[PDB]
Amino acid sequence: QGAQVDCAEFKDPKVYCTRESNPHCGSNGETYGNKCAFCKAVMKSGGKINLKHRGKC
């Protein structure tokens, strides 16, 4: 595979949260707005809640 899009990995930070970071379908049933917001949610959930589609699902 050679790695995937991991969340915590860009928490240096130097990446602005909650405005501009591209839309994406998260594996549950929702088109998440920013990557930070998706990441913040990923932390809670359960276990492995990766993205798949860009934009709408």
UniProtKB/Swiss-Prot annotation:
Annotated tissue distribution: Seminal plasma.
Keyword Signal: yes
GO cellular component, as recorded: extracellular region
Residues annotated as site: Reactive bond: 19-20
Occurrences of domain Kazal-like (ranges): 2-57
Subcellular compartments: Secreted
One Gene Ontology molecular-function label: serine-type endopeptidase inhibitor activity
Keywords associated with the record: Disulfide bond, Protease inhibitor, Pyrrolidone carboxylic acid, Secreted, Serine protease inhibitor, Signal
Disulfide cross-links: 7-39, 17-36, 25-57
Function (record text): Serine protease inhibitor selective for kallikreins. Efficiently inhibits KLK4, KLK5, KLK6, KLK7, KLK12, KLK13 and KLK14. Doesn't inhibit KLK8. Inhibits acrosin, trypsin, and chymotrypsin.
Miscellaneous comment: The sequence of BUSI-IIA is shown.
Identification of the protein by name: Serine protease inhibitor Kazal-type 6
Species the sequence originates in: Bos taurus
Gene: SPINK6
Span covered, complete protein: 25 to 80 of 80
